[PDB]
Amino acid sequence: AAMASVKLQGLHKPVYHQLSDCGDHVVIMNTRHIAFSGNKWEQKVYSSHTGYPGGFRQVTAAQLHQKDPVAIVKLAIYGMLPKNLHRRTMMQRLHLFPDEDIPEDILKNLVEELPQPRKVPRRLDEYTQEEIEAFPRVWSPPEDYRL
Amino acid sequence: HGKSVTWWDEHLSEENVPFVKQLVSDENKAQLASKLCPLKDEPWPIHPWEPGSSRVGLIALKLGMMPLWTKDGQKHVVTLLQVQDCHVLKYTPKENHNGRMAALTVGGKTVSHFHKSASILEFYQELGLPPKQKVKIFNVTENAVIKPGTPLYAAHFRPGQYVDVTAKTIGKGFQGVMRRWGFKGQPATHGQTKTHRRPGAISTGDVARVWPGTKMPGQLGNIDRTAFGLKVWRINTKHNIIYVNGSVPGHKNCLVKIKDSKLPAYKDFCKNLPFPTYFPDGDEEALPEDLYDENVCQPGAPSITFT
Amino acid sequence: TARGTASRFLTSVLHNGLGRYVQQLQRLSFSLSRDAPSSRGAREFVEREVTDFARRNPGVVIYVNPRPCCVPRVVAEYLNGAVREESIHCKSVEEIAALVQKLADQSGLDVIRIRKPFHTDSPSIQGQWHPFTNKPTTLGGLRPREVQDP
Amino acid sequence: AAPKNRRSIEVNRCRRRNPQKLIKVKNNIDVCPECGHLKQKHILCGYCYEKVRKETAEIRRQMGKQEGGPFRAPTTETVVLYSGETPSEQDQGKRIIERERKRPSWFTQN
Amino acid sequence: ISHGRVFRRLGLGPESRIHLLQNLLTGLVRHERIEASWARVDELRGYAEKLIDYGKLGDTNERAMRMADFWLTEKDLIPKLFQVLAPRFQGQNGGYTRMLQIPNRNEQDRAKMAVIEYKGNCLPPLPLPRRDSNLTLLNQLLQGLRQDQEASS
Amino acid sequence: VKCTRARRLKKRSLRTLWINRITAASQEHGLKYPAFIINLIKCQVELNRKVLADLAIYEPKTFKSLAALAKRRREEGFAAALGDGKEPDGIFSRVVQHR
Amino acid sequence: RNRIPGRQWIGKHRRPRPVSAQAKQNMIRRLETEAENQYWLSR
RNA sequence: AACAAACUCCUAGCCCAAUACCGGACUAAUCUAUUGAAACAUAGAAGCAAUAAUGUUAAUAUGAGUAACAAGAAGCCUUUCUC
RNA sequence: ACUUCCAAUCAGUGAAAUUAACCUUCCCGUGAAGAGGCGGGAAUAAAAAAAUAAGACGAGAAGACCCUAUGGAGCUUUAAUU
RNA sequence: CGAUGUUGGAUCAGGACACCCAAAUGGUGCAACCGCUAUUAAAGGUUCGUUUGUUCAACGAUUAAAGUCCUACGUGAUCUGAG
RNA sequence: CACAAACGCGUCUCAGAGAUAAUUAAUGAUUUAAUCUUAACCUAAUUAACUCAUAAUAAAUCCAGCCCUAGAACAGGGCACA
Ligand SMILES: [K+]
Ligand SMILES: [K+]
Ligand SMILES: [K+]
Ligand SMILES: [K+]
Ligand SMILES: [K+]
Ligand SMILES: [Mg+2]
Ligand SMILES: [Mg+2]
Ligand SMILES: [Mg+2]
Ligand SMILES: [Mg+2]
Ligand SMILES: [Mg+2]
Ligand SMILES: [Mg+2]
Ligand SMILES: [Mg+2]
Ligand SMILES: [Mg+2]
Ligand SMILES: [Mg+2]
Ligand SMILES: [Mg+2]
Ligand SMILES: [Mg+2]
Ligand SMILES: [Mg+2]
Ligand SMILES: [Mg+2]
Ligand SMILES: [Mg+2]
Ligand SMILES: [Mg+2]
Ligand SMILES: [Mg+2]
Ligand SMILES: [Mg+2]
Ligand SMILES: [Mg+2]
Ligand SMILES: [Mg+2]
Ligand SMILES: [Mg+2]
Ligand SMILES: [Mg+2]
Ligand SMILES: [Mg+2]
Ligand SMILES: [Mg+2]
Ligand SMILES: [Mg+2]
Ligand SMILES: [Mg+2]
Ligand SMILES: [Mg+2]
Ligand SMILES: [Mg+2]
Ligand SMILES: [Mg+2]
Ligand SMILES: [Mg+2]
Ligand SMILES: [Mg+2]
Ligand SMILES: [Mg+2]
Ligand SMILES: [Mg+2]
Ligand SMILES: [Mg+2]
Ligand SMILES: [Mg+2]
Ligand SMILES: [Mg+2]
Ligand SMILES: [Mg+2]
Ligand SMILES: [Mg+2]
Ligand SMILES: [Mg+2]
Ligand SMILES: [Mg+2]
Ligand SMILES: [Mg+2]
Ligand SMILES: [Mg+2]
Ligand SMILES: [Mg+2]
Ligand SMILES: [Mg+2]
Ligand SMILES: [Mg+2]
Ligand SMILES: [Mg+2]
Ligand SMILES: [Mg+2]
Ligand SMILES: [Mg+2]
Ligand SMILES: [Mg+2]
Ligand SMILES: [Mg+2]
Ligand SMILES: [Mg+2]
Ligand SMILES: [Mg+2]
Ligand SMILES: [Mg+2]
Ligand SMILES: [Mg+2]
Ligand SMILES: [Zn+2]
């Protein structure tokens, strides 16, 4: 959301000004595979009130992502944009897709892809045999121990 | 251009008003009688029944109520629902209506051409049917699709089945809070001053507002309601009359949406029923005049003896 | 306030001062009195400074019309057609000289709020910023997720 | 209850000029074929009916003079005859009303 | 909730409702053409239709005489009903009276007026709304259909 | 009253606007605003934020050189810290005093 | 839901506002300056 | 690091906040003494200045076209009916 | 349940308390200690007619309770003067 | 204090859980039944009468149970005025 | 129940899947035992909420007039054979 919020407002254009209608579309794909840091999948809760008495609903982050795949990302951006009346206008330019299923119309409008903010660590099975042999063996286990 | 309002009878001469009525009347009979061969006009393929399949309902007219007695001596009240003119109008593909089940459109009883919109009349002209009064949307699985223009009869429901009823209830206008919600009223004689049917306190002092769910006087009655778990006792063939247990919503001579019951207990109770609908031509046999449930005391049956 | 009055951009009339400088003041007309005590400042200015002022500024025409009046006035007209009324009622000799000298240095445009303290024509030297002025070009101009034709 | 503040003219103009409160135009106005005046499609012509009502009053005024009593009513049918006419064979046996003016065009003899 | 109610509340109550229609009906019998408020005239039409039915019964029937005694408040109209109105109406069954909407009264109340009259009255005819003649352009086009239809069928 | 207070705030708001434009044009070259300013002052280039914003918009090439100058100066500062501290000042880090 | 009784900066119960890392540095910077102040006044 | 004040530098100056009380310099509009004569000057005098007293008089709104008020019917027009 | 007077629509005449300006939302927190206006967030095309009275510390009477005033008066007496 | 109308009931109830009932469970000086005690859960429900102005309390009958408390000890521009 | 209706004291209908808290059990390491695991993988028994399947709503642009089991007004349903 941090880099997506900047693009929507236009804070990357040196011609930026709040009165001007400068603004750029942002297309975010693979929003079902977001990785919440720490235990925020079970601790962070999104709450809303329907207005009617007894209509206070609190939903865990895991539950909300299981029902609406794009709700987690949309709410994060929806709270980081400026709280003026332009927030509704600039949210319409944000396109979210749960997976890599984008209509051909949207694909033809793209220009460049922003780099990923977090470097994805690789699992053990993704390391090549050259890397495994390159890393030294720290210790020598005894031969008589049963693993 | 301030064009003046006009109606069909404005410019018709006295010698042509009967002629126009005859002209439209003859077209209706020719069009209706030309649809009486659903299986002889290249119908869509018919698939065998499968678990979890849904059938097509009807649009019927509520006549009235009759008492009915069962073989155990108990008394039941049945509502006479008559199917006057029922035809499937249009078919919507699965992915264009809901994404899970296809939609089949069913019309109501015949009405006059002279009091419908241009688009509505044009739509029926392409199909070749007289205009209908009420049009409802039915959710039907892909294995029970019916070619549009296929007539439907009251034999579509066999006695012993449980059906639902959806229709607009009796509108009682702008009714007070006592009638609408059932709030108790204030006493009538122990000094009460200009307060006998008012709701009273409507909120609390602290909140300083009225909650959205608060009950207040307003419109009552003219809304869509559904009745579930109504058993079918008797089916009449020549008059196309359906008997349903209990009371159905809606006033007399109204149009009622009838469908198979969606309650969990009454699931998959359509294997022993016509699928996708009753075709009189295919059977090539005459059904009984009246179809009775096994627990119904027929009018031409011997008197009940508890010996 | 700014929202109450009009505004104009910093503009020089007839591109003055680019090729040559032309004194935009055109004429002055003094309406003083020979007997009113309030016209003493005007009378002293005419006797002493008017003759010397005309020599320094040969491009202006000075009219003196001593007539019965109560409030002495000086009217200055400029080339662009703007006429500015002024009052020299009961002012000292040196105050008149400062006021007249100020009228000689004004370009004649309306005295309202100036939106910007600068004016320029064709300021986009070596190019102006557009969202494509700093983005590298991809081989073949391919979109981020575009499949190659072959 | 009493108002809390004075309503501004901006709010009042919105309420006093709402399309509901404006006068709706009428599109069912037509010219009467006989007299050329104005009438509505579903309403009898005002000028033509007033023409009939004035004549009807004169006929009824003549009848009153032919029955002096307040409780005198004919036991037979009534026929109205104008100047230059005589009762027909089918019109015999009925009371006769005489009017001096010529028979009007709109009134039709049978 | 006024579902199924075919009557209207007029005057000071159910009793005054009959008396108001009693005076109007008496005026209608004597004069054969009266004008009143459209709502009151609409109610009067129902009674005028059935009063002729009692007249057709005869001068000897006791119920008809008693029924006509109450409604005809002026006693010189009973012979008229059984000897003029009833003999005149023998052919038609329900086409006894006509109702047309007179324009609004030129007074403050601006009430909706109506004119009620008996068939074959001895008065100048009302300006009835005449239909288009068969020579009109639309009627001529439709008459072409009828001639062609009758030629083949 | 609001006219005078806004006039005081007019200078603050325009200064804030310029910094956003400078940050926007600096992030385009991969250099943050805090690094672009301190590493430019070390080159004894006394340009206020007003003219830097104008160079950002109307001088895309020149602003790149200033951004290039700041990045080169910054990389020299880290080299001295990484070393023993006895390294001679960088070719761009030499301080010239006018007297 | 949770309120600070009375005024939030006076009384027995106050706001739990903690000292920040920036505030610690400000104290040290003034302390270093004042440490130099009392050395030049020594002799 | 950075961003950040009525603080402090920079360019020009007419070169530093305020409630009760106290000090000073100017001044709108009247009349009079002399000037002035498309509306002023130096003086001398006062019924000498109103965004605020549930202020006074007069006029306007808002609440509001809202609350509330009245004529028994038909006709031949003033005669018959209903109470 | 049903009638009449009210009521709502149409035609005529047409008043009152009230009113700083209002382009007059909800929640939590703050605050002269109970916020439509502040702060953090939410909601949000504009108007009309008909209803219910939680809030605008609603409208009405310069609080009758209570205290103060070297402010009054009525009543009683073993107050003072007479 | 140029007014924040004051007990109880009637109407409508919003909320908390320190739970009276309804659901799940640990312990017992828990064999079963009837109990005592502790953890978890607030969507729904929590009676009708005699006396007192009564809230409270006593008593009769019953219920799965007749919970505690906040809401200007909710609610008089909705009613009641016994106190 | 003196309207062709309204009404109760009368009649009719009332539901599947996921998901959980305390708690219970399997496999097993830090601690080659054991051990329900703010150790991992898989898996089991299990309150109420809650969410959802599902059902209701569905036709842009005849509308003067009359009728209506539609209705304050405005809307809505009928007016071909009746
Ligand atoms: K405190
Ligand atoms: K209220
Ligand atoms: K008080
Ligand atoms: K509860
Ligand atoms: K362990
Ligand atoms: Mg109704
Ligand atoms: Mg009651
Ligand atoms: Mg009273
Ligand atoms: Mg009463
Ligand atoms: Mg609130
Ligand atoms: Mg309504
Ligand atoms: Mg009716
Ligand atoms: Mg009436
Ligand atoms: Mg009628
Ligand atoms: Mg506080
Ligand atoms: Mg503190
Ligand atoms: Mg600063
Ligand atoms: Mg000072
Ligand atoms: Mg003070
Ligand atoms: Mg003076
Ligand atoms: Mg004064
Ligand atoms: Mg004034
Ligand atoms: Mg007042
Ligand atoms: Mg005043
Ligand atoms: Mg005046
Ligand atoms: Mg007005
Ligand atoms: Mg009002
Ligand atoms: Mg009224
Ligand atoms: Mg009116
Ligand atoms: Mg608003
Ligand atoms: Mg608050
Ligand atoms: Mg706010
Ligand atoms: Mg805010
Ligand atoms: Mg009203
Ligand atoms: Mg209202
Ligand atoms: Mg306020
Ligand atoms: Mg209050
Ligand atoms: Mg008040
Ligand atoms: Mg006082
Ligand atoms: Mg007292
Ligand atoms: Mg004292
Ligand atoms: Mg005293
Ligand atoms: Mg005294
Ligand atoms: Mg005295
Ligand atoms: Mg004494
Ligand atoms: Mg007050
Ligand atoms: Mg209570
Ligand atoms: Mg509750
Ligand atoms: Mg608990
Ligand atoms: Mg329990
Ligand atoms: Mg209370
Ligand atoms: Mg009370
Ligand atoms: Mg009251
Ligand atoms: Mg109240
Ligand atoms: Mg009392
Ligand atoms: Mg082990
Ligand atoms: Mg759903
Ligand atoms: Mg319609
Ligand atoms: Zn005419």
Instruction: Supply the DSSP string of chain F, one letter for each residue.
Output: -HHHHHHHHHHHHHHHHHHHHHHHHHHTTT--HHHHHHHHHTTT----HHHHHHHHHH-HHHHHHHHHHHHHHHHHHHHHHHTTS-SPPPTTT------
A to B CB pairs, distance under 8 Å: 8
Polymer length in residues for chain D: 110
Residue type, B16: N
Taking CA atoms, A68 is separated from A4, A55, A90, F69, in Å, by 20, 20, 21, 48
Q: Measured from the CB, is B11 under 7 Å from any atom of strand J?
A: no
* D 72-101 residues with CB < 8 A to E: 72-80, 97
| Nearest of B100, B106, B47, B49 to residue B270 by alpha carbon | B49
Measured CA to CA, the distance from residue A16 to residue F28 in angstroms comes to: 14
Which two three-digit tokens encode residue B55?
A: 């059938």
| Nearest of F1, F54, F63 to residue F26 by alpha carbon | F63
The helix (H) or strand (E) run that includes residue C38 is none
Backbone angles phi, psi at E81, to 5 degrees: -65, -45
CA angle E71, E74, E80 (to 5 degrees): 85
Q: Measured from the CB, is B43 under 7 Å from any atom of strand J?
A: no
Is B165 in a helix, a strand, or coil? strand
Taking CA atoms, D57 is separated from D54, D62, D80, D97, in Å, by 5, 9, 13, 13
Contact indicator for D48, D32 with CB cutoff of 8 Å: yes
**How far from chain centre, in Å, is Cα A26?**
12
Which two three-digit tokens encode residue D35?
A: 């007299």
For tokens 């709030």, name the residue: B183
The helix (H) or strand (E) run that includes residue E149 is helix E137-152
Measured CA to CA, the distance from residue B184 to residue C15 in angstroms comes to: 88
* D 35-64 residues with CB < 8 A to E: 39-40, 42-46, 48-49, 52, 55-56, 59-60
Q: Measured from the CB, is D20 under 7 Å from any atom of strand I?
A: yes
Taking CA atoms, C20 is separated from B102, B251, C15, C54, E150, in Å, by 84, 96, 9, 21, 102
Q: How far is the centre of ligand 19, averaged over its atoms, from the C-alpha of G10 (Å)?
A: 22
Please check whether residue C1 touches F, CB under 8 A. Answer: yes
Contact indicator for B153, B56 with CB cutoff of 8 Å: no
Interchain contact, E143 vs B11, CB within 8 Å: no
How many CA atoms lie less than 13 Å away from B260 in the CB half-sphere? 25
- Give the count of beta carbons closer than 10 Å to the beta carbon of residue B160: 17
Residue type, B112: S
Q: Measured from the CB, is B187 under 7 Å from any atom of strand J?
A: yes
Flag whether E47 is in a domain: yes
Contact indicator for F74, F33 with CB cutoff of 8 Å: no
Judging by DSSP bridges, how do beta strands E33-37 and E113-118 pair with one another? antiparallel
Q: How far is the centre of ligand 56, averaged over its atoms, from the C-alpha of C142 (Å)?
A: 59
For tokens 């019951």, name the residue: B261
Which two three-digit tokens encode residue B127?
A: 């199909």
Q: Looking only at Cα atoms, what is the longest distance across chain G?
A: 61
D77 Cβ contact list (under 8 Å, min separation 6): D93, D94, D95, E84, E88, E122
Measured CA to CA, the distance from residue C30 to residue D86 in angstroms comes to: 110
Q: Measured from the CB, is B305 under 7 Å from any atom of strand J?
A: no
Ligand nearest to the CA of B194: 9
- Give the count of beta carbons closer than 10 Å to the beta carbon of residue B124: 19
CA distance C127 to chain F (A): 7
| Protein-to-nucleotide distance from the CA of B136 to the C1' of J54, whole angstroms | 62
Contact indicator for B165, B249 with CB cutoff of 8 Å: yes
Question: Which chain A residues contact residue F20 at CB under 8 A?
Answer: 11, 16
Give one word for E6, left, alpha or beta, with left for phi > 0 and alpha for psi -120 to 50.
alpha
Measured CA to CA, the distance from residue E22 to residue E16 in angstroms comes to: 9
Measured CA to CA, the distance from residue B222 to residue D109 in angstroms comes to: 57
- Give the count of beta carbons closer than 10 Å to the beta carbon of residue A112: 10
Contact indicator for F66, F40 with CB cutoff of 8 Å: yes
Virtual torsion, Cα C138, C141, C145, C146, nearest 10 deg: -140
In DSSP notation, C64-88 reads E---S-SS-EEEEEETTS-EEEEE-
D16: nearest nucleotide, CA–C1' criterion: I48
| Nearest of A86, A73, A71 to residue A9 by alpha carbon | A86
Interchain contact, F25 vs A11, CB within 8 Å: no
For tokens 């009784």, name the residue: G5
| Nearest of B283, F8, A26 to residue C144 by alpha carbon | A26
Measured CA to CA, the distance from residue B81 to residue B276 in angstroms comes to: 21
Give one word for C91, left, alpha or beta, with left for phi > 0 and alpha for psi -120 to 50.
beta
Virtual torsion, Cα B32, B33, B39, B45, nearest 10 deg: -10
Interchain contact, F24 vs A13, CB within 8 Å: yes
Domain count within chain F:
1
Neighbours of chain B (3+ CB pairs under 8 A): A, D, E
Please check whether residue E110 touches D, CB under 8 A. Answer: no
Measured CA to CA, the distance from residue F29 to residue B9 in angstroms comes to: 79
Flag whether E133 is in a domain: no
Domain extent for E55 = 10-121
Which two three-digit tokens encode residue E73?
A: 């408040």
Measured CA to CA, the distance from residue A5 to residue E56 in angstroms comes to: 92
Which two three-digit tokens encode residue E90?
A: 């023998």
A47 Cβ contact list (under 8 Å, min separation 6): A56, A57, A58, A59
For tokens 């007029």, name the residue: E10
Which two three-digit tokens encode residue E88?
A: 């005149």
End-to-end CA distance of chain B: 85
B200 assigned ligand-binding residue: no
Domain of E51: which CATH number?
3.90.1030.10
Backbone angles phi, psi at E108, to 5 degrees: -65, -40
CA distance C117 to chain F (A): 13
Interchain contact, C145 vs A110, CB within 8 Å: yes
Backbone angles phi, psi at E100, to 5 degrees: -135, 150
Domain extent for F45 = 1-99
Q: Measured from the CB, is D15 under 7 Å from any atom of strand I?
A: yes
Backbone angles phi, psi at E35, to 5 degrees: -125, 135
Q: Measured from the CB, is D6 under 7 Å from any atom of strand I?
A: yes
Question: Which chain F residues contact residue A16 at CB under 8 A?
Answer: 20-21, 24
Question: Which chain D residues contact residue B6 at CB under 8 A?
Answer: none
Q: What per-residue string of b and e applies to E120-134 under the rule 16 or more CB within 10 Å gives b?
A: ebbbbebbeeebeee
For tokens 């250099």, name the residue: F31
Flag whether E143 is in a domain: no
| Nearest of A26, A14, A44 to residue A96 by alpha carbon | A26
Domain count within chain E:
1
| Nearest of B163, B160, B155 to residue B293 by alpha carbon | B160
Directed axis angle between helix F2-27 and helix F33-41, to 10°? 90
- Give the count of beta carbons closer than 10 Å to the beta carbon of residue B48: 8
Measured CA to CA, the distance from residue D76 to residue D94 in angstroms comes to: 6
In B108-170, which ranges are E strands?
135-140, 162-168
Ligand nearest to the CA of G3: 15
Asked whether the bond before D104 is cis by omega within 30 degrees of 0, the reply is no
G24 Cβ contact list (under 8 Å, min separation 6): none
Q: Measured from the CB, is B201 under 7 Å from any atom of strand J?
A: yes
CA angle C139, C141, C144 (to 5 degrees): 95
Flag whether E99 is in a domain: yes
Flag whether E147 is in a domain: no
Question: Which chain A residues contact residue B211 at CB under 8 A?
Answer: 51-53
Measured CA to CA, the distance from residue F58 to residue F63 in angstroms comes to: 9
Contact indicator for B115, B74 with CB cutoff of 8 Å: no
F44 Cβ contact list (under 8 Å, min separation 6): F95, F96
Contact indicator for B280, B151 with CB cutoff of 8 Å: no
Question: Which chain F residues contact residue C123 at CB under 8 A?
Answer: 58
Residue type, B106: V
Measured CA to CA, the distance from residue E106 to residue D53 in angstroms comes to: 15
Contact indicator for B9, B18 with CB cutoff of 8 Å: no
Contact indicator for D34, D48 with CB cutoff of 8 Å: yes
Sign, CA dihedral B220-B223-B226-B230, equals positive
Contact indicator for E56, E82 with CB cutoff of 8 Å: no
G13 assigned ligand-binding residue: yes
| Protein-to-nucleotide distance from the CA of F89 to the C1' of K56, whole angstroms | 82
| Protein-to-nucleotide distance from the CA of C48 to the C1' of J27, whole angstroms | 120
B137 Cβ contact list (under 8 Å, min separation 6): B103, B104, B105
Measured CA to CA, the distance from residue C102 to residue C25 in angstroms comes to: 11
- Give the count of beta carbons closer than 10 Å to the beta carbon of residue E145: 13
